[PDB]
Scaffold this active site. Sequence first.
Site, PDB file in Angstrom:
ATOM      1  N   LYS A  61      -1.900 -12.871  60.677  1.00  0.00           N
ATOM      2  CA  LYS A  61      -0.528 -12.504  61.007  1.00  0.00           C
ATOM      3  C   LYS A  61      -0.169 -11.177  60.361  1.00  0.00           C
ATOM      4  O   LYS A  61       0.469 -10.330  60.981  1.00  0.00           O
ATOM      5  CB  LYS A  61       0.449 -13.594  60.566  1.00  0.00           C
ATOM      6  CG  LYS A  61       0.230 -14.916  61.280  1.00  0.00           C
ATOM      7  CD  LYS A  61       1.250 -15.954  60.863  1.00  0.00           C
ATOM      8  CE  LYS A  61       1.256 -17.114  61.849  1.00  0.00           C
ATOM      9  NZ  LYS A  61       0.036 -17.948  61.740  1.00  0.00           N
ATOM     10  N   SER A 166      22.370 -20.893  38.818  1.00  0.00           N
ATOM     11  CA  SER A 166      22.379 -19.437  38.937  1.00  0.00           C
ATOM     12  C   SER A 166      23.306 -18.757  37.923  1.00  0.00           C
ATOM     13  O   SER A 166      23.075 -17.601  37.564  1.00  0.00           O
ATOM     14  CB  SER A 166      22.775 -19.031  40.358  1.00  0.00           C
ATOM     15  OG  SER A 166      24.010 -19.634  40.705  1.00  0.00           O
ATOM     16  N   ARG A 168      23.721 -19.554  34.661  1.00  0.00           N
ATOM     17  CA  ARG A 168      22.976 -19.348  33.420  1.00  0.00           C
ATOM     18  C   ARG A 168      21.839 -18.355  33.608  1.00  0.00           C
ATOM     19  O   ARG A 168      21.440 -17.662  32.666  1.00  0.00           O
ATOM     20  CB  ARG A 168      22.445 -20.685  32.888  1.00  0.00           C
ATOM     21  CG  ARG A 168      21.825 -20.563  31.512  1.00  0.00           C
ATOM     22  CD  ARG A 168      21.698 -21.910  30.832  1.00  0.00           C
ATOM     23  NE  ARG A 168      21.079 -21.756  29.518  1.00  0.00           N
ATOM     24  CZ  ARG A 168      19.810 -22.052  29.248  1.00  0.00           C
ATOM     25  NH1 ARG A 168      19.008 -22.526  30.197  1.00  0.00           N
ATOM     26  NH2 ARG A 168      19.338 -21.868  28.020  1.00  0.00           N
ATOM     27  N   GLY A 175      26.448 -19.847  44.169  1.00  0.00           N
ATOM     28  CA  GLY A 175      26.664 -20.733  45.309  1.00  0.00           C
ATOM     29  C   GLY A 175      27.620 -21.863  44.998  1.00  0.00           C
ATOM     30  O   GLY A 175      28.439 -22.270  45.822  1.00  0.00           O
ATOM     31  N   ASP A 178      27.297 -25.414  38.379  1.00  0.00           N
ATOM     32  CA  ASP A 178      26.449 -26.473  37.830  1.00  0.00           C
ATOM     33  C   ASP A 178      26.748 -26.644  36.344  1.00  0.00           C
ATOM     34  O   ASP A 178      26.479 -25.735  35.549  1.00  0.00           O
ATOM     35  CB  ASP A 178      24.974 -26.127  38.034  1.00  0.00           C
ATOM     36  CG  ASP A 178      24.628 -25.880  39.492  1.00  0.00           C
ATOM     37  OD1 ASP A 178      24.706 -26.849  40.277  1.00  0.00           O
ATOM     38  OD2 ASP A 178      24.300 -24.723  39.853  1.00  0.00           O
ATOM     39  N   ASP A 239      28.914 -29.372  40.646  1.00  0.00           N
ATOM     40  CA  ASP A 239      27.866 -30.323  40.304  1.00  0.00           C
ATOM     41  C   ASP A 239      27.861 -30.518  38.797  1.00  0.00           C
ATOM     42  O   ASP A 239      27.698 -29.543  38.039  1.00  0.00           O
ATOM     43  CB  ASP A 239      26.481 -29.830  40.753  1.00  0.00           C
ATOM     44  CG  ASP A 239      26.296 -29.860  42.270  1.00  0.00           C
ATOM     45  OD1 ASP A 239      27.123 -30.471  42.971  1.00  0.00           O
ATOM     46  OD2 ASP A 239      25.282 -29.309  42.757  1.00  0.00           O
ATOM     47  N   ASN A 262      11.269 -24.552  38.842  1.00  0.00           N
ATOM     48  CA  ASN A 262      11.028 -25.935  38.441  1.00  0.00           C
ATOM     49  C   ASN A 262       9.766 -26.498  39.085  1.00  0.00           C
ATOM     50  O   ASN A 262       8.979 -27.209  38.438  1.00  0.00           O
ATOM     51  CB  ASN A 262      12.230 -26.827  38.797  1.00  0.00           C
ATOM     52  CG  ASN A 262      13.409 -26.625  37.861  1.00  0.00           C
ATOM     53  OD1 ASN A 262      13.256 -26.107  36.755  1.00  0.00           O
ATOM     54  ND2 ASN A 262      14.594 -27.037  38.298  1.00  0.00           N
TER      55      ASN A 262
END
Length: 314
Positions: A61, A166, A168, A175, A178, A239, A262
């Site tokens: 490709k 994001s 931290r 977005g 957290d 969250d 992660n």
Amino acid sequence: HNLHITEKLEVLAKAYSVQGDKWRALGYAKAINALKSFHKPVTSYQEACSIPGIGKRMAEKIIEILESGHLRKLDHISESVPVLELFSNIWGAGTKTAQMWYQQGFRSLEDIRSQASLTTQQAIGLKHYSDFLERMPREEATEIEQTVQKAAQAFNSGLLCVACGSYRRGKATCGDVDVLITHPDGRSHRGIFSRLLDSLRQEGFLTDDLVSQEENGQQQKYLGVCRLPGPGRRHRRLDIIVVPYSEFACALLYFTGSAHFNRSMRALAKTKGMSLSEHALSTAVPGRVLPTPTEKDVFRLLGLPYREPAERDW
DNA sequence: GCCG
DNA sequence: CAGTAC
DNA sequence: CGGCGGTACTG
Ligand SMILES: Nc1ccn([C@H]2CC[C@@H](COP(=O)(O)OP(=O)(O)OP(=O)(O)O)O2)c(=O)n1
Ligand SMILES: [Mg+2]
Ligand code: NA
Ligand code: NA
């Protein structure tokens, strides 16, 4: 760094992802990253083959994009893909639900609103559709974390509240927000979700709940929706996780991410006869939990140099 | 899709 | 459980 | 040949 082969590949990767071919999409993701990590614009087929994450098919490709300036496969992407993407961007709907809605003849969010059966979560995702696709300035994420921290510290001032994800990692925009909550005494984290969420509800801060098992004294997370007071505010995703102090480093490492980071770290732990989760770093199998008082200990036990959160933004 |  | 989520 | 991170709610 690079480049413009990836731009074509990402179109293909997204098409595979929204259509549910998750492992093929994963392969594209890893190839796209290998390509973006290479300093030099790849020129040789053999060169674009020596790269880990690039095989015979990804090479071909690449060669076609170099020679022709185009990838012929992009001309034969299913017409369903833009609608599948539209639908799966509803929070609580994924590829399976998107594909079913498409099979049922739905083509627009108006179709979904008026004719689809929605889960409670999906109805919330739909009514906040635009807002949930926005990112907020990190200044706003600070205000939201402070709101959560003030409510928490109001009934136990020893509660440790840290904005992760994001935020931290130092990103300019976020977005969602957290927030990790723990307590250094190792026990005062227990059962606090009811009190914390009730507090945040009293002031009208929380507007909708998405995931919140409040019948469970062992509830680990809250996923929901909030809005700061005053004009010019949008609904933002929030969250929260509440964790025992013994799991702080692993919870912090997990919730900071990135998600890609992660996965990479957990993959690496496997190769060393270990297992890494948001609860603990263990030897493999259950196994034996290793002492990890700080994030630095996790890196160390995996034979890795420490990386600052900003250096985990993969 | 990639890899072992 | 499958789906969706972090 | 066959796995790819490891885990937490929902209904
Ligand atoms: N598939 C996933 C998704 C998320 N996370 C972890 C790492 C990131 C953390 C928060 O998730 P997000 O809020 O989705 O990620 P983010 O890094 O904060 O990025 P964003 O700014 O888009 O929220 O949870 C993970 O381990 N695996
Ligand atoms: Mg986030
Ligand atoms: Na979705
Ligand atoms: Na609930």
